Every structure is written in C-alpha cells, then in structure tokens.
RNA sequence: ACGGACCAAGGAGUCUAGCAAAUGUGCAAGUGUAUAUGAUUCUUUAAACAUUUUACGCAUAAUUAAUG
RNA sequence: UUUUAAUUUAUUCAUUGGAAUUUUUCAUGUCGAGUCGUGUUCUUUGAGAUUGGAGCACUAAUACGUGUGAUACAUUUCACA
RNA sequence: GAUGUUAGGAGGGCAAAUCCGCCGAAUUUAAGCAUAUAAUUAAGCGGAAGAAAAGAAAAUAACUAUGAUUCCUUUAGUAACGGCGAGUGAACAAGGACCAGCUCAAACGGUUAAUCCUUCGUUUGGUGCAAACCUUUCGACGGAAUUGUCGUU
C-alpha cells in the first residue's frame, strides 16, 4: 500500500516537502548530462503504474528537453511566401515535449531497446525533465515472459518515432473518442485519403 | 423530452414520456490516507491564501475567495468545490 | 457559366487522378471470399461457422419498428438461458457486456431464442470415445453410435439467420367497437403545449426523491 | 460513340465550329462561378435569383432521423389494402378496416383528397393532420395515435 | 492518354434483360427468323425443336 | 502583312465526374436491386443467372428563419 | 508431396496436484496527477463566444467524482461512459 | 557510478507500391489580390509489416434504443465552414463484409519470492543415410528481485 501513499504525496507538488524535493532533484538533473541512465526509477509508483516492471530487461533513462517552441527553420528570419505563412516565431510543434523526450533517447542512443512509456519527474524554467522506460526485446527474462513479450516482436520498433507511445497517442488525437475527434480515428492521413478517394464501379 | 422510470409511457408520439408502452425495469483506508498525507504535505500557497481569506470572514470575503479559487483553478464548479472544502476544513480545525 | 443550368459545385479542384480507383476485381473477390468461407466451414468439422446474435430493436425514431441482429446477447439473457457467457462463447453464442435489457419484452424475445439454440446442441467427445456430462451449462455429450448417426443430416441455418418477423398490417375490428369521440389532433397539440410543465414536474419530483 | 460526335462531322473546317474571330480560348470569362455579381451577374439574376446572401438560424447538427416523417394523404388510404379486402370491406356495414400506416412506412396523414362516403376507417398513424382527422370523423372512421 | 477509369461496363435494367431474353426465345421459335439469321434448317421438321 | 524549299510518316474538342434538354427503350405511383448474398456458373466465365413473405437514392406535397 | 475433415485400441495400478460449475458470511474495496481542466497564443477542423493538437501560466476532484450530450453563462435534473 | 581488445547479444545500411510520425511551400483559383483555395498536398527528415494503423467507449443516441476497430452502399455535396465571395465539408442512425476479446495498477502467500534469468553436466522418446531438428528434467552453481516477480482476481 506504499504506492498509494507515494501517489497521494506526489499529487501535491506545491507542499513544502514536494517543493524542496522537486527543487533539489531538478538542480541535480540540470547538471547531469542531457540523456543518462538511472539505475532505479525515481518514481517507482508512476513507473509501475505505467508498463514498467522489475525484470532484468527493463532500464530507465532520464532526458532533458528544452522548453518553449522551436521557431520556424527558415534562413535568416524571412520566408518567401504569403502573409498567411510569414509567421516564424509563434510556431507550435505538434509533437509534445514529452514525446520529444524519448524521441531523443530511443532514436540512436538506445536503438537496441524499445520505448514503453515516459513520465514527469521534474521541471525547470528552461528545461523539462522526464524518465523513459526502455525494454530490451532480446533479454531472455523479458522475452520468455508470457506477458509483456509483445514488445519483443519486430512490429513495435521505434514506437516513439512512429507515434505509438502514450504521448504519440495524445498528440495524434487518439486520446479522445467520439464526435470530438471523428476524423483522426483511422489516423488523420488515412482518413483524409479515404474521404478524398472516389470509387467508380465498372458497370456504373 | 423526459421519461419516467415509473408510470409507464403513453402511446402518444409527442410530449411527456412518449413512445411505446413496453414494460420497464430498474472508507477507513481512504481516511487514513487523507490524514497522513495532510499531515505530511499541509496546504499549497493558494490553499493558505484561500484559508486566511475565508478566515477574515465577511460576505465580501466569501465573494473574493470564490473569485480567487475560480481564477486559480479555472471553471466555476472547481472553484466552488474548493471553497466549500476549505471552509469545511477551517471549521474542522477551529476545534 | 452560361444559359439556364444548375450552378456547378463539382468538388474536383485537387489532384484526384491519384485518388480515383475502379473495382474491376469485384466478382473476383466475391468468389475468393465465397471459397474462403466454404473452406472454413468444410475444415471446422461440420459445426456451422455462423454465430447466434440477438434479435433487437433498431435505435432512433426513424427505425423504431424494425428489428435486426445485434452484437451479442446480454448477461441476464445468458443467465436466463442458464449459460455463463465465459462458457457460452464456446457454443457459437455472441455476447457483449455493453447491452442492457431495458424491457421485459426484449428479455423474453431473446430468452426463448437462446433456449431454441440450446435445444439443437450436439456436443462431441475429446478423449477418444470418453463422452462426459459437460461443464458450465453446456448440454450433454453423445457417444459413438449417436455421433455416427447425427453427423450426416441437413444443418439448420434459419435460426442463425435473422428472425423473420411477420406483422399484420392488414387487420380490422368491429364497427361498433370504435371510440368515435377521440380527438387525435387536439391530443397532439395539447401534449406539445403541455410538454414544458410536465418536464418541470418531473424535475421537481426527482429533486424531492433525492431527499 | 465517337463516330456520332459533332466534332467528327466538321473535321476539315479549320475553326472546329468555334468561330473564326471569337476563337476558342481557355476560360475567357473566368473559372467556375467566378463572375457572380460582377459580369455574370445578369445570368445569376436571370436564372438563380436568391443565390447570394443567407437567411435563417443555424441548426448546428441536424440528425435528420429526429424529424424524418413520411406522409400520406387520405385519398390513398383505401389504396394500401388489396382489392379483394376492399371489396369485402365495402359490402358489409358491420366491419371496418384498421390501417396502421406506420407499417407501410408513413408517419403523418394529411387530408388531401376525398374519402369514400359512409365507409368507416380506423387509422393508426404516428401523426395526424387536422383536416385529415375531420374527413375521417365525418366519413365515420376514427383516428388512432401510435408511437 | 487512355485511362483505366473509362466507362468499360454498362448498367442494364434487369427488366430490360429479361424482356430481351424472352424476345430472343420467342424469335428462336419462328422458322423464318432462324433461317434468315444464318442457320441452314431447310431439312428439320419443326422449328421449336425438342428432343427426349 | 505574317507561315510555307521539297517529300514521307505522326499531328490537335477527347476521357471522367456532375446537371439539364432532346430522342429511343422498359416499367409506372412507383422505379433503380446499392454493397452484399447462392450456384455441381466457373479455358471462354472479370459475364450471365437469382434475391425465404419495408436498406437506401429520386419521385409521390408544399411552405416557413423556425417551434412547425 | 504439405495438412485437414472422417476414420485401427483401449485396458488397467496408483496417489498427487491443480482447476472449473453451485449454497453461509464478510467489504463495498480499488479504479492511472504537472494529469484533466481553465486562461492565453499559434496551428488544425465543417466544428462555428474554438474540433483536435501544441507552447506558456494556473492547476483539480475521488466514483455521491469528472467527462460528454455541437451557443457563452449561473442554479439544477436526466441519459451514457 | 567509471573502466573494460571480460562472457553473451542487439542498433547502424539497402529497399517503399501500400503503411506510421514530423516538417512543409508555391504554381493555381478567386477572371486583380492580401483571408480563403491549391493543401493539412508537392519537396525534405525519420520508422515497420505482409499488410501497417485503429481497436474494446470518459461512444452514440433521446429511441420500443444501440454496443471494440476497419472497410463497402448510403447518410451527403447534407449539418456546417467561407472577402458567406471563389470555394470547402463531416458525424449519427440504416444495409452489408468480417467478427475474439483481453492484462497491467491495489487484496491476500510474511508458519517462508510462493518468482525470473545465466552457465555447467545426466536422461524422456522421436521423425532425417547424414547434418540438424522436435521433445526431455534430475539438478547444481551463479545471480536478479521485497525500491515488488509470480501465484489471486
């Protein structure tokens, strides 16, 4: 029952104890490298509430992602286009910083592992921090498990690059069903293709 | 329109309970959690401000506290819930 | 535009040749899926490949009168038939935990249908001629001679098919037994006029019931 | 069908039936409905008067199933039942036909037409028109409301 | 350029089709029509020919 | 006034979507059997054949911003 | 030739374990937090006093809740999840 | 934590018609043009499979109610959006194809981690001429794991 206690404390984030812990841990993380392995999860309750377990093939990585939007990538500061597109500064990326977090770590740094999820951990004025759960598809401990061995087969490769993690489902509109989303359900591009696609029967 | 779980519907098509005439049919652990977590954490700064602002205790104070909670949380329902909860805890703690 | 013609609105202003598709392979795929289901039915071993579905009313007010096959029977329907769902999925019975029986007529129209389906079950042994009584409300099993004499008759598919519903549009009553004094139009107008206050009354009734 | 086309009959006429001075240029007046209110305004006013502007509230989402309501007039009520049934109904004065138009797919009954004088008809309809009621009651029938 | 989405097939009314089938069946039952179509039937006895 | 030194071959109102008019055809207050379904149809067969006693499209009623 | 429907053969000895179907009691439990949500900005959408997403600020409740029910708001019912 | 010419393993690149993310125009139309349209397209970057993705309601309805997702006919060029200009444009219900549903989070085993992995040898029988392959479990050792695996729903 310790995890319920842990969740209830972490639900505050504004008490004196939570403020002190967040401050000190954020300070340590800022000086720690951008992407680095953590021996044990710093939020065991949240890790295990997500897909993390305690088998040998599970690792945890902490990543720092710069806050704010990234600005248009146009040369100098000037685009050759219409006023509708001359905007450069207020460009908001569709991928959330949470998804970019494990995008950094699962791309090439840990290519032999598969991203399962990522959680909050910390914050700063100019950085956002996260911890990412990685699974080794090749360790026999996870591979032999009748559970959680779906990640071993090569269909779940680079879920964070393909937008298949929780953050990906969030920014793809998959976290809302019904009439609010409507279009995004079979994926936005596939739905648009289906709606633009016109079918003609042979016999008219 | 509106139906009624009792008084079965009339055969009329438009009005009150219209339609066919078919027949119808029909924490001690939590308190311990809350107590220990309250002991460890206390109140957030806006909780403290709302507590003292209710404490000073006027009608204008209650209105200002409702406005503050609504601004700090978004929506009106959440602000009302928090204001009622904090005055409840104020009464409880004034023991 | 010119002359007297309907103003064009042809939504064809983008790259549409990429999206145009023609179904040359319509009858081909109809045949391929025909043989697919025939192969499945031949291979499964004489058991029908269809699954029983509830006969249930269509939603909305457009299709109030019509009825159609639904997605699985309800838990209370299966319990009334005497089958737990977790063991009734085994006999080709569809079940969903989302439907709720809102009327005794809906309950009683599916209960006897489930009983009719249960009346045709012919269980098979598993352990090389060691027939048993069964589990979980599934009917009993038959022996060598019994299976050898039943496995070769005509299978029944009408029950699997949607239930044909015969509703007597053509019917009549005695002339003296008519309520000549009724005012249908006035009744409709009065109900529409009085709709608001009855909603008021139900609101206050339920507020009282909350106490 | 190419051999029946008008262009085939003027293969050696240089201008292909599109004039010698005016010629056949590509979009000489604009594309689509370009010239509304400016230079195709005469055509718009002569063939599509009420095109421009907007009127009425907005029904934010319609859900046409809510207001779906097929209609039938009184003079067609005797048409649904077969000829033999109609014959056996008209002769005997002690028996009257009961018609559930919602079975046939009709929801409201309007009163356009003329009902056969002195044959009572009981009609079960989801909705009824006032004059339809009046005609039925005058002929001696009675309207039944169903849902 | 020729495109695959040309109107290759045609929709013929089922009533059209059964009318045409009946008409062709009837035409097969008159000696003059089948003779003129191209069949050399001067030696057969009856034009609605039937065999056991 | 512009093109044309000569000859051979190729060379340009077409295809699809949607609407209307015209005419022919079938049925007719109905009409079209859509997707699909079955059938000892299954070089020819990717077409023909059929639809266990209310799918929808258009028409059969219009008018109003709209309760209607 | 691959398998897949029907089809030669079960008999015992043994305790060893487990499972599933149905009666008496408890206990009405748990139910995903910098998350939802709100404000603002940009983008996206048929979505329009904002459809979704994203950036920043604020930052929840605990099932008697909050989330939808296509017009913003207050008080309050109902339905579904 | 650092380090291993420690033991055992993976990632890189090629290939894209279908598929999944990001980024992202303009030509064009509006007979001009700036919102709009082109287009959530072209180009660019990254990532898989034989299909991918979506998928088991924080759904729809308002009815006698339905019951994961996907696709086809239709809703429907409709509701709606739009210098309300040019143009853009769904969703519910309905008819079908197909149809399988499930497990992690807390309870309890604390009169016993009941779990998981590595390595080293033995055997339980087999189809192959062979090579290999399917099955076999006595273990022992070394660990991981109570900062929580499995059993229990």
Q: Is B55 left (phi over 0), alpha (psi -120 to 50) or beta?
A: alpha
Pairing mode, strands D122-125 and D95-100: parallel
- List the single residue in B with minimal CA-CA distance to C199: B2
Stated in angstroms, how far is A1 CA from H108 C1'?
12
Mutate: best of C1, C2, C189, partner D, most D CBs <10 A: C1
Q: How many CB atoms lie within 10 A of CB D133?
A: 24
Distance in angstroms (rounded) separating the CA atoms of residues A184 and A186: 6
| In contact, B15 and B1? CB cutoff 8 Å | yes
Asked if A196 lies within 8 A of C19 by C-beta distance, the reply is: yes
Give the pairing of strands C170-174 and D95-100.
antiparallel
Helix axes A16-31, A2-10, angle to 10 degrees: 80
Is A194 an interface residue toward C (CB < 8 Å)?
no
Dist. CA A130–CA A29, nearest whole Å:
10
d(CA D141, CA D80): 16
Put simply, whether E3 touches A (Cβ < 8 Å) is no
Q: Please, are residues A45 and A3 in contact by the beta-carbon 8 Å criterion?
A: yes
Residue with tokens 């006969």: C55
Named by the residue before each, gaps in chain A exceeding 2.5 A from C to N are none
Do B54 and B88 touch, CB atoms closer than 8 A? no
Q: Give the determination technique.
A: cryo-EM
Through-space separation of residue C187 CA and nucleotide H61 C1' in angstroms? 27
Chain A residues touching residue E5 (CB < 8 angstroms):
200
Compute the distance between CA of residue C189 and CA of residue C184 in angstroms, rounded to an integer: 9
Q: Which residues of E touch C22 (CB under 8 A)?
A: 4-5
Question: In whole angstroms, how large is the CA radius of gyration of chain A?
Answer: 21
Which residue is associated with the tokens 């002991």?
A: B39
* Residue A38 φ then ψ, to 5°: -110, 130
Place of tokens 């391929």: C32
Residue A80 annotated as part of some ligand binding site: yes
Nucleotides of G under 7 A from a protein CB: 4-7, 9-10, 20-22, 29-39, 41-43, 45-48, 51-63, 65-71, 73-81
In SS3 terms, A114-178 reads as EEEEEEEEEECCCEEEEEEEEECCCCHHHHCCCCCCHHHCCCCCCCCCCCCCHHHHHHCCCCCCH
Cβ atoms within 10 Å of A57's Cβ, excluding its own: 23
Q: Which two tokens stand for residue D97?
A: 């036909």
CB A184 within 8 A of CB A191: yes
Dist CA B73 CA A14 (whole Å): 14
Q: Chains touching chain B at 3 or more Cβ pairs under 8 angstroms? A: A, C, D
Scanning the structure block, which residue is given the tokens 């494990």?
A102
Q: Using CB atoms, which residue from C1, C172, C188 is nearest to D127?
A: C188
CA of A56 to C1' of H7 (A): 17
Kindly identify which residue of chain B lies nearest to residue A6, measuring between CA atoms.
B37
Query: Does the distance separating the beta carbons of C21 and A200 come in below 8 Å?
Result: yes
Query: Is A8 close to B33, i.e. CB distance below 8 A?
Result: yes
Q: Is D97 exposed, middle or buried (0-12, 13-18, 19+ CB in 10 A)?
A: buried
Which segments of D7-105 are extended strands (E)? 71-73, 95-100
Please report residues of B whose CB lies closer than 8 A to that of D146: 11, 13
Straight-line distance from CA A94 to C1' G41, in Å?
14
Which among C172, C182, C189 is the top mutation candidate for probing chain D, defined by the most D β-carbons within 10 Å of its own β-carbon? C172
Interface test with A, best of B35, B41, B42, B43 (most A CBs within 10 A): B41
- From CA C113, how far away is CA C77, in angstroms rounded? 10
* Beta strand D71-73 pairing with D108-110: parallel
Q: In the 8-state DSSP scheme, what is residue B54?
A: H
- Residue in C16, C20, C26 nearest the CB of A202: C26
**Which chain B residue shows the shortest CA-CA distance from A16?**
B41
Contact C83, C136 (CB under 8 A): yes
Nearest by Cα to B82 from B62, B63, B66 = B66
**Closest residue by Cα to residue A136 from A128, A145, A125:** A145
Q: How far is B10 from chain C (nearest CA, A)?
A: 11
Q: Which residue of C has its CA nearest to B18?
A: C191
Chain D residues lying within 8 Å of C175, measured CB to CB? 93-96, 120
Q: Which of C170, C190, B11, C188 is nearest to D127 (CA)?
A: C188
**Cα D79 to chain centroid, rounded:** 20
Instruction: Assess contact for D35 and D41: CB atoms under 8 A.
Output: yes
Q: Is C188 on the interface with B (CB under 8 A)?
A: yes
* Cα gap A16→C126, rounded to integer Å: 67
Using an 8 Å CB-CB cutoff, list chain B residues near A18.
41
Return the residue matching tokens 């008519």: C178
Name all chains with 3 or more CB-CB pairs below 8 Å to chain C: A, B, D, E
Structure tokens at C148: 């050898």
Q: Which chains touch D (3 or more CB pairs under 8 A)?
A: B, C
Interchain contact C173–A (C-beta under 8 A): no
What is the crossing angle of helices A2-10 and B28-41, to 10°? 50
Closest CA relative to residue A57, chosen from A148, A114, A142: A142
What is the token pair recorded at D57? 């509230």
Give phi and psi for A61, each to the nearest 5.
Answer: -125, 135
Among C188, C107, D137, D130, CA closest to B10: C188
Give D-chain residues touching C65 at CB under 8 angstroms: 102-103
| Structural contact between residues C75 and C92, judged by C-beta atoms closer than 8 angstroms | no
C1' (G27) to CA (C96) span, angstroms: 28
The answer to whether D and C touch (≥3 CB pairs < 8 Å) is yes
């Amino acid at each position: 029952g310790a995890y319920k206690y842990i969740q209830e404390i972490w639900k505050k984030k504004q008490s004196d104890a939570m403020h002190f812990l967040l401050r000190v841990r954020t300070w340590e993380y800022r000086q720690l490298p951008v992407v680095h392995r953590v021996s044990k999860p710093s939020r065991p309750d949240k890790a295990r509430r997500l897909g993390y377990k305690a088998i040998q093939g599970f690792v945890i990585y902490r990543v720092r992602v710069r806050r704010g939007d990234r600005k248009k990538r146009v040369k100098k500061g000037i685009v050759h286009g219409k006023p509708k597109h001359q905007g450069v500064h207020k460009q908001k990326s569709t991928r959330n910083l949470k998804s970019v977090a494990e995008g950094k770590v699962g791309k090439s740094i840990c290519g032999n592992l598969r991203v399962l999820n990522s959680y909050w951990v910390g914050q700063d004025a100019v950085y956002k921090y996260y911890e990412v759960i990685l699974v080794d598809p090749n360790h026999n401990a996870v591979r032999n498990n009748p559970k959680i061995n779906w990640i071993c087969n090569p269909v779940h490769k680079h879920r964070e690059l393909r937008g298949l993690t929780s953050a990906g489902k969030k920014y793809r509109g998959l976290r809302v069903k019904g009439h609010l989303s409507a279009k995004s359900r079979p994926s936005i591009r596939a739905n648009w293709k289906r709606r633009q696609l016109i079918k003609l029967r042979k016999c008219r | 329109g509106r139906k009624s779980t009792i008084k079965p519907a009339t055969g009329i098509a438009v009005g009150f309970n219209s339609g066919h005439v078919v027949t119808k049919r029909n924490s001690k652990r939590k308190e311990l959690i809350k107590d220990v977590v309250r002991e460890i954490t206390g109140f957030s700064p806006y909780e403290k401000r709302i507590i003292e602002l209710i404490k000073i205790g006027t009608s204008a104070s209650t209105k200002r506290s409702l406005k503050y909670a609504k601004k700090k949380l978004g929506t009106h329902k959440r602000g009302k819930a928090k204001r009622e909860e904090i005055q409840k805890v104020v009464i409880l703690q004034r023991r | 535009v010119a002359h007297n013609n309907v103003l064009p609105n042809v939504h064809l202003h983008k790259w549409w040749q990429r999206h145009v598709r023609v179904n040359f392979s319509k009858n081909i795929k109809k045949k391929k899926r025909r043989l697919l289901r025939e192969k499945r039915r031949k291979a499964n071993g004489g058991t029908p490949i269809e699954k029983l579905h509830p006969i249930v009313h269509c939603p909305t007010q457009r299709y109030n009168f019509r009825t159609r096959l639904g997605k699985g029977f309800t838990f209370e329907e299966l319990k009334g038939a005497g089958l737990t769902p977790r063991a009734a999925q085994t006999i080709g019975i569809c079940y969903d935990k989302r439907r709720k029986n809102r009327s005794e007529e809906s309950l009683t129209k599916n209960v006897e249908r489930l009983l009719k389906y249960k009346n045709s079950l012919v269980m098979i042994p598993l352990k090389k001629n060691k027939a048993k009584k069964g589990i979980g409300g599934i009917p009993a099993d038959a022996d060598k001679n019994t299976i050898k004499e039943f496995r070769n008759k005509k299978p029944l598919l009408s029950i699997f098919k949607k239930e044909k519903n015969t509703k007597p549009f053509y019917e009549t009553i005695e002339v003296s037994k008519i309520d000549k004094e009724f005012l249908a139009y006035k009744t409709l107008r009065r109900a529409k006029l009085a709709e608001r206050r009855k909603n008021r009354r139900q609101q206050k009734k339920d507020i009282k019931f909350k106490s | 069908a190419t051999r029946f086309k008008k262009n085939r009959k003027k293969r050696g006429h240089v201008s292909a039936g599109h004039g010698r001075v005016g010629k056949h240029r590509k979009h000489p007046g604009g594309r689509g409905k370009a010239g509304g209110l400016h230079h195709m305004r005469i055509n718009f006013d002569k063939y599509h008067p009420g095109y421009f502007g907007k009127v009425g509230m907005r029904h934010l989402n319609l859900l046409k199933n809510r207001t779906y309501c097929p209609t039938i007039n009184v003079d067609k009520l005797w048409g649904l039942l077969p000829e033999e049934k109609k014959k056996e109904f008209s002769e005997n004065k002690d028996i009257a036909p009961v018609i559930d138009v919602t079975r046939k797919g009709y929801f409201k009954v309007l009163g356009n037409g003329k009902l056969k004088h002195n044959q009572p008809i009981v009609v079960k309809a989801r909705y009824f028109s006032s004059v339809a009621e009046k005609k039925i009651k005058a002929v001696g029938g009675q309207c039944i409301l169903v849902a | 350029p020729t495109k695959i989405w040309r109107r290759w097939g045609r929709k013929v009314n089922l009533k059209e089709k059964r009318y045409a089938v009946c008409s062709s069946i009837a035409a097969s039952g008159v000696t003059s029509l089948v003779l003129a179509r191209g069949h050399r039937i001067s030696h057969l006895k009856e034009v609605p020919l039937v065999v056991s």
